Design a protein around this motif. Sequence first.
Motif, PDB file in Angstrom:
ATOM      1  N   UNK A 148     -28.239  -6.736  47.731  1.00 34.10           N
ATOM      2  CA  UNK A 148     -26.893  -6.685  48.283  1.00 34.10           C
ATOM      3  C   UNK A 148     -26.814  -6.946  49.787  1.00 34.10           C
ATOM      4  N   UNK A 149     -25.640  -7.410  50.208  1.00 36.97           N
ATOM      5  CA  UNK A 149     -25.215  -7.378  51.592  1.00 36.97           C
ATOM      6  C   UNK A 149     -23.854  -6.717  51.671  1.00 36.97           C
ATOM      7  N   UNK A 150     -23.491  -6.289  52.862  1.00 40.46           N
ATOM      8  CA  UNK A 150     -22.252  -5.561  53.051  1.00 40.46           C
ATOM      9  C   UNK A 150     -22.430  -4.055  53.073  1.00 40.46           C
ATOM     10  N   UNK A 151     -21.363  -3.358  52.702  1.00 42.68           N
ATOM     11  CA  UNK A 151     -21.342  -1.911  52.771  1.00 42.68           C
ATOM     12  C   UNK A 151     -22.366  -1.288  51.836  1.00 42.68           C
ATOM     13  N   UNK A 152     -23.057  -0.269  52.328  1.00 45.70           N
ATOM     14  CA  UNK A 152     -23.992   0.478  51.493  1.00 45.70           C
ATOM     15  C   UNK A 152     -23.300   1.093  50.287  1.00 45.70           C
ATOM     16  N   UNK A 153     -23.999   1.057  49.165  1.00 44.86           N
ATOM     17  CA  UNK A 153     -23.502   1.515  47.881  1.00 44.86           C
ATOM     18  C   UNK A 153     -24.561   2.403  47.227  1.00 44.86           C
ATOM     19  N   UNK A 154     -24.128   3.528  46.642  1.00 48.76           N
ATOM     20  CA  UNK A 154     -25.012   4.432  45.913  1.00 48.76           C
ATOM     21  C   UNK A 154     -24.710   4.417  44.429  1.00 48.76           C
ATOM     22  N   UNK A 155     -25.734   4.725  43.637  1.00 48.87           N
ATOM     23  CA  UNK A 155     -25.641   4.758  42.189  1.00 48.87           C
ATOM     24  C   UNK A 155     -26.228   6.064  41.691  1.00 48.87           C
ATOM     25  N   UNK A 156     -25.553   6.689  40.736  1.00 54.49           N
ATOM     26  CA  UNK A 156     -26.092   7.822  40.004  1.00 54.49           C
ATOM     27  C   UNK A 156     -26.066   7.485  38.529  1.00 54.49           C
ATOM     28  N   UNK A 157     -26.551   8.407  37.721  1.00 52.97           N
ATOM     29  CA  UNK A 157     -26.459   8.266  36.279  1.00 52.97           C
ATOM     30  C   UNK A 157     -25.007   8.161  35.799  1.00 52.97           C
ATOM     31  N   UNK A 158     -24.063   8.630  36.603  1.00 49.26           N
ATOM     32  CA  UNK A 158     -22.657   8.659  36.213  1.00 49.26           C
ATOM     33  C   UNK A 158     -21.857   7.462  36.716  1.00 49.26           C
ATOM     34  N   UNK A 159     -22.261   6.863  37.825  1.00 47.20           N
ATOM     35  CA  UNK A 159     -21.473   5.786  38.382  1.00 47.20           C
ATOM     36  C   UNK A 159     -21.809   5.526  39.823  1.00 47.20           C
ATOM     37  N   UNK A 160     -20.991   4.715  40.479  1.00 52.48           N
ATOM     38  CA  UNK A 160     -21.275   4.249  41.827  1.00 52.48           C
ATOM     39  C   UNK A 160     -20.339   4.868  42.841  1.00 52.48           C
ATOM     40  N   UNK A 161     -20.839   5.053  44.044  1.00 55.43           N
ATOM     41  CA  UNK A 161     -20.042   5.558  45.154  1.00 55.43           C
ATOM     42  C   UNK A 161     -20.397   4.766  46.402  1.00 55.43           C
TER      43      UNK A 161
END
Length: 262
Positions: free
Chosen positions: A236-249
Motif C-alpha cells: 500500500x501507499x497512502x494512509x496507514x490501515x490496520x486489519x483485525x480478524x473482524x475488519x479494517x480500521x
Amino acid sequence: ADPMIAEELLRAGRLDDALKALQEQVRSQPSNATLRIFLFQLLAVMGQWARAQNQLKVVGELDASALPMVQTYSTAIDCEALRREVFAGRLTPVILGQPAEWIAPLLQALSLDAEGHGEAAQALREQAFDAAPAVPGRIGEAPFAWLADADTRLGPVLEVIVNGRYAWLPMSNLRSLKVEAPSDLRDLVWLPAELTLANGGATVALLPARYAETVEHGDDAARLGRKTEWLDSGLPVGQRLFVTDAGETALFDLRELDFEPT
C-alpha cells in the motif's frame, strides 16, 4: 490576491498548484511566520524533505517559541530517510521495549526482496508471523483476537519515533495507544500518540502516518492521507490501515487501542 488561495488548492488536493501559490505568498511576505509554518508542512506532505527542513529553520528563527517543534519535526524528517533505508533492506531499526526475535526474519525479508528473492522473503515473513505471540485487545469498544498493519512487511508492528529516534514497536509490547484525529497539516505525515508499554512506562511518540513509498509512488490524494491504494508491488501507499480478524480500521479513525494483559 485571495489570501486563502493556497488553502483552497490544498483542500482540492492540488499539491503542486498549492505549493506554487504559497511560494508566491511567502515571497511577498517573507517575514510572515504563519506562512512559513504552512510551507514547511506542505513541503513535508509533498516529501520535499530538505526544503521542509530549511523552512522549519526559518520558522524557529522568526518565532523562537517554535524551537521545540522545530527540533521534533526536523528529526522526524531525518527519520523518513531511515525508513527508506529500512524498507530497502539496508539498515535495521531499533526494537522498542522487550526484545522480539521474530522481527529478525521480518527484516531479513526486506533484504531478500531487495535482492530479487521474493519467494524466499515471503517464506521468512511466514516464519516471523508464526512466531509472533498472540495478544487479543480492543479498538475502542470492539474486541479483536489479533491486529496487524495492512502492510505485510510489518504485520503486528508499529513504526514509531520516540525522543527523536525511530523504532519498530512490536504491538505485543503495548498496553495501550491513544491518538486524536489529525489537526495540523503535519499530523497527516506524523500522527502524535501516547504509548504505554506492557509492564512498563508511558511516552509521547510520533507515528509515521503514511507508507514510506507514498511520496515517490502515490498520487496527491495518497500523500494527503485521503486514500490507501495498492501498487503493482502488492503493497500500500497512502494512509496507514490496520486489519483485525473482524475488519479494517484506518489510522485516522483510530482513537484508542488496548491490549489484554498476558
